[PDB]
Ligand binder design. Structure first.
Ligand SMILES: CCCCCCCCCCCCCCCCCC(=O)OC[C@H](CO[C@@H]1O[C@H](CO[C@H]2O[C@H](CO)[C@H](O)[C@H](O)[C@H]2O)[C@H](O)[C@H](O)[C@H]1O)OC(=O)CCCCCCCCCCCCCCCCC
Ligand SMILES: CCCCCCCCCCCCCCCCCC(=O)OC[C@H](CO[C@@H]1O[C@H](CO)[C@H](O)[C@H](O)[C@H]1O)OC(=O)CCCCCCCCCCCCCCCCC
Ligand SMILES: CCCCCCCCCCCCCCCC(=O)OC[C@H](CO[C@@H]1O[C@H](CS(=O)(=O)O)[C@@H](O)[C@H](O)[C@H]1O)OC(=O)CCCCCCCCCCCCCCC
Lengths: 154, 185, 68
């Protein structure tokens, strides 16, 4: 559910795309409604992957999800440089970019197992390196640890 | 099921230490060290004077007095300032002053109890005509030893005032248990 | 100035009424020796035979006797 990083991306996708549909469809002009109607398909795919239940049922859904996330991250990313403008309609134009982003980082957090364990390991490694830097800075500039600590064997 | 006549009165654990064997119970100061009745008892049966100090302060402490709470945490500071934070010389002169004041308030309470006996006789006359004009000496000692609740005092006074019956007494008030409110006190 | 000196004199008179050790219980959290309170013992490095002589002389001077 919400206890895994891929689950975080999926939940985020669902939330964002729900707000997207509720900001565009609920509120060549019809393509602005078709591309937001497809956000509910994106939400359906992410609610399918929310229980990723034999994994072979959702493996092909994951492959289609990541391939079309790459296709959206091509189309929308080259859209401003190809002539069309994206900044005009915020409440319409935002959630497709957002779900493409979450889709790409899903193809990075899924493809490599990742999980909260690697996040905690990376946070601990960064904090540990900063801890050794802090200890070296203290022992070299502030107060020697042989002076600060209590010498035993008196 | 196995109902033994008298309805079973549950006997809870004591919450206050029993009063000391040198106590008087009458608001009068106790003696300095020896409670003065030992001279009217045989030697080597007066062993229970130190056997009151033991089991009043070492071996029979009620567990309601060992409770750790916020109020007892605050009160430890008052007791510490009294015992190890204030000199015993000033504690001694304050002890003498408190002893003299308590003797004076005991004399005042004794005079008040005698006047309450006179009021007992007056209320026992107004309520039985003129026949009963005495007063209950056991109730006098009960007032002196603080064994009466204010409700018991009012009920007895009303009882005298409208039917007489000097020697019909209210029940003796039970000791007040130590109040406890979780972690507060 | 008399009020400030009187406050200091009141503190000193309170200490005088304290006087000595009487009236105070022994405390298991505060023994009379800091070596008891902390954990300070002599070990292999530092202690030498002559140190007994020097310890004897220091203890004689601390007790107040002019013998060594
Ligand atoms: C011949 C010598 C000349 C002088 C001698 C007599 C003259 C004057 C006596 C003192 C002044 C008046 C005292 C009246 C009320 C007592 C004050 C008090 O609060 O009550 C003091 C209590 C009573 O003492 C202890 O009291 C205990 C607790 O009982 C009572 O404790 C409290 C009494 O306050 C509560 O009322 C509580 O309800 C009640 O149970 C025990 O029962 C014992 O009685 C005893 O151990 O002490 C405590 O807890 C508190 C301890 C420190 C308080 C110090 C207050 C005064 C110090 C004066 C120092 C000046 C030195 C110069 C000398 C001249 C004196 C002015
Ligand atoms: C209006 C609604 C109420 C507003 C406030 C009115 C105050 C109500 C308090 C009085 C109740 C008396 C009572 O229950 O009697 C009934 C009590 C019950 O009686 C006692 O009960 C004990 C518990 O079992 C034991 O059995 C004793 O043996 C028994 O005597 O009788 C007494 O009179 C005993 C003493 C009462 C305790 C103190 C009275 C509280 C008020 C005075 C405190 C002043 C502090 C101000 C700050
Ligand atoms: C509103 C907050 C009211 C707080 C509770 C009031 C009454 C509780 C009580 O039994 O008082 C008991 C306290 C001592 O606390 C007692 O003190 C005891 C140690 S001693 O009596 O000081 O030696 C300690 O063992 C016990 O846990 C502690 O309750 O006795 C008093 O002298 C009460 C003074 C303050 C009221």
């Amino acid at each position: 559910s919400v206890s895994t990083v891929a689950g975080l991306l999926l939940t985020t996708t669902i939330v964002v795309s729900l707000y997207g549909l509720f900001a565009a469809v609920f509120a060549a002009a019809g393509l602005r409604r078709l591309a937001a109607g497809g956000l509910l398909l994106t939400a359906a795919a992410s609610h399918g992957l929310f229980d990723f239940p034999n994994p072979t049922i959702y493996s092909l859904l994951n492959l289609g999800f990541v391939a079309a996330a790459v296709l959206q991250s091509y189309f929308l990313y080259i859209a401003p440089a190809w002539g069309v403008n994206v900044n005009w309609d915020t409440a319409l134009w935002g959630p497709m970019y957002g779900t493409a982003f979450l889709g790409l980082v899903y193809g990075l957090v899924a493809l490599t197992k990742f999980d909260w364990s690697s996040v905690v390991d990376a946070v601990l490694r960064v904090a540990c390196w900063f801890a050794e830097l802090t200890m070296w800075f203290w022992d070299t500039f502030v107060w020697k640890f042989s002076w600060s600590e209590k010498t035993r064997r008196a | 099921f196995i109902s033994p006549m008298t309805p079973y009165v549950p006997e809870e654990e004591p919450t206050r230490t029993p009063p000391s064997i040198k106590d008087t119970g009458t608001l009068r100061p106790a003696s300095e060290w020896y409670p003065q009745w030992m001279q009217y008892r045989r030697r080597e049966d007066n062993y229970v004077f130190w056997q009151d100090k033991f089991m009043r302060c070492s071996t029979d402490i009620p567990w309601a007095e060992k409770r750790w709470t916020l109020f007892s945490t605050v009160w430890y500071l008052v007791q510490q300032l009294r015992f190890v934070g204030t000199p015993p010389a000033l504690r001694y002169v304050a002890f003498l002053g408190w002893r003299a004041l308590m003797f004076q308030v005991y004399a005042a309470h004794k005079a008040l109890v005698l006047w309450q006996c006179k009021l007992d006789a007056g209320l026992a006359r107004i309520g039985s005509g003129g026949a009963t004009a005495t007063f209950s000496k056991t109730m006098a000692l009960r007032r002196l030893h603080w064994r009466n609740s204010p409700l018991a005092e009012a009920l007895y006074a009303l009882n005298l005032y409208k039917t007489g019956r000097v020697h019909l007494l209210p029940p003796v008030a039970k000791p007040i248990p130590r109040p406890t409110f979780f972690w507060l006190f | 100035a008399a009020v400030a000196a009187g406050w200091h004199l009141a503190s000193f008179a309170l200490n005088l009424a304290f006087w000595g050790v009487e009236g105070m219980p022994p405390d298991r959290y505060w023994p009379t020796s800091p070596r008891i309170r902390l954990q300070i013992r002599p070990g292999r490095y530092g202690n030498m035979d002559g140190g007994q002589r020097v310890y004897m002389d220091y203890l004689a001077r601390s007790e107040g006797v002019p013998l060594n």
